[PDB]
Amino acid sequence: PHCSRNPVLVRGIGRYSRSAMYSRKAMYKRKYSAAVLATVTKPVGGDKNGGTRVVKLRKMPRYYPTEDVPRKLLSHGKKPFSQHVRKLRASITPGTILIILTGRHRGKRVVFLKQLASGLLLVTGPLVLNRVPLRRTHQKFVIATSTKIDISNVKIPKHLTDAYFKKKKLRKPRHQEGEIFDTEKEKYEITEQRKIDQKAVDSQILPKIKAIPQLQGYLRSVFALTNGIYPHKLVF
Amino acid sequence: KKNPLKNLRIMLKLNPYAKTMRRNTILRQARNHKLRVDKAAAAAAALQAKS
RNA sequence: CCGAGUGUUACAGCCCCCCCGGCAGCAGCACUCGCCGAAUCCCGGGGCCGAGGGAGCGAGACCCGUCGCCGCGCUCUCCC
RNA sequence: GGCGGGUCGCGCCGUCGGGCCCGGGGGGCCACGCGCGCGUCCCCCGAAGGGGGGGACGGCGGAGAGCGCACGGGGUCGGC
RNA sequence: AGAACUGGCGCUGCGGGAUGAACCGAACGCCGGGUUAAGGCGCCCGAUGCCGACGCUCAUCAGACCCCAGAAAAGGUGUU
RNA sequence: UAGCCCUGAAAAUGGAUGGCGCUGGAGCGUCGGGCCCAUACCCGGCCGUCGCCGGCGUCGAGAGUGGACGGGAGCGGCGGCCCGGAGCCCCGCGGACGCUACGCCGCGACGAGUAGGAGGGCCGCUGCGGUGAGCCUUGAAGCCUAGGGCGCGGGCCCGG
RNA sequence: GGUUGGCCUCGGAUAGCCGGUCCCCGCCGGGGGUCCGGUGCGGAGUGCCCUUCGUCCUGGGAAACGGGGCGCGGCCGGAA
Ligand SMILES: [Mg+2]
Structure with a gap:
């Protein structure tokens, strides 16, 4: 199984033509001329009785609803969210300082690390400077500041991923009693593994942060529009 | 009705030569680009060789 | 002595114009020649509003029309 | 002895046209049964009225199998 | 007051002409996005809050946008 | 001689470039680039109307825009001792909705309106023939309602 | 209903602004020589706070007023 052998230049237009790919593929000398299980039967299992049992499983249903809707019409490919594409802005490369616009944090300045596998971008302005742990954020709710920090060979742990930073819920109790789900008052003390996962990266970005002078106090600060400070007049 | 002149392969369902x-024409204005970028450099490279 | 400001007849001893012979290498270009254009044309991106509506010529289909046209690549040869 | 009209011939023009051709001394092509015989055209050879090649064929002598993809493809879904 | 040709009003909303039968644009099912027509963009009042271009003009009665809603002969060493 | 301004230029309630107001213009002439919006134009959704049709094949077995057999001769592809022949559904007995044909489905263009003319009313009122094994003193008609809705509307259904 | 306040020369415009030896008006102000800056940088295209997460440990620069006051008391300043 070779690779694509036809380098694109524009989306869906290969560089080599139809006849030029007939000779790159050598299709002239590979032209050709050459050319269930309903189920398994079961043992009988009983005295005075033979006749190994019927070839049938996954039987006809016990019930049909009184009405049914017609089948859809397929239309095209409209692939699901696990397969779409991952797009970044060119103003966001790793190491960049970001500004959180809509969180609980709302203007805390954070250090961008990695764009995760399903769109959200992994970020921490480190917990000793901000109050920002290894949270995900979303791309279009941050502001890429034109300052960066050069962390191009630090580390990133492979185990912390999109299914790491998820919220947890298992809806067993359906009975109307005065406790709200018995697990909703509780802030998670499962940090005991997430705390170790930060000190693996909290202890190797503060060397980078405490190399350029003012930056650690800049990260302690928060962002605010004050009086004549207008965005569109501001070089971020 | 989709728009030829806007998406590919609706042109190509109607006009295979397109x-x-x-x-x-994407090849030749990628090589005319190379022919003019190298001309602007290699002229002013010999100019940078003098001074 | 130097410099400035005026007024004369004066034609290189600032310059400018018109000619007869040139070069660099030519740019509708170092935003005034901006002209008029694209089978002589394409690429990429941002804003907005919208999402209306039993396709299987095959298998005698069976959890389950990722199907038609259209353009595309991979294998049923081999080597690096 | 001057001023035009039609025709012939000469050299000179133009990213001319005829896919032309015609023998010779890198880029593009929706173009691909070696063996031979059905015509056509061209190249050869000493002859001099024959064979040996090549190019192309709107016709016959030589001349099947889909396998899983991906999709600017018969009006949006998420297996967020 | 009375005819000719065409359009309109009557039967016809809508944008504009401040106002309106007939002017000027445009004719109309119920809505969203886009773009314009006539007209406009100091503020009523949407839009020139353009570093708009060249000139003309001083009124002790200035001027100010089809129909259209106020002026003439004559004159001024007023200014161009 | 002709542009602007001035004289010529007087009317009755207080008053009209629409007003406020404007004089490096918000005036007049010649023009530029932006920009503002109609029921107009374009693209989309829906309603109706007109036009042109589709479907009796509910045919999960129909497979059909040229098909037969069956004889005399031929090549390919199939199972060899270079000679050879129909298999009619099945391991699953299964397979959505539909066609009030006066109903369903598709596609395209259109939609102003007085006088006037037609069509539809599953709009409404009163009585009659039929019919709902209708409905009710465990509450009919009528009337009231900041109650719940439905229809483009005429109107209607329900709750109290 | 609002998401920080500016606690102030006169004004000229074919001209203004600042700093300053000497000559005069009860230790302030008016005049002139002198020096500046001036598409205003002693610049509301600005300036002071600030975009201050808090705290702890622990060193340098700065800093000798303390700064928030429900303290206490006194002064005179401000009549459009
Ligand atoms: Mg007209």
């Missing part, structure tokens, strides 16, 4: 009309 693909090879298009990579014959």
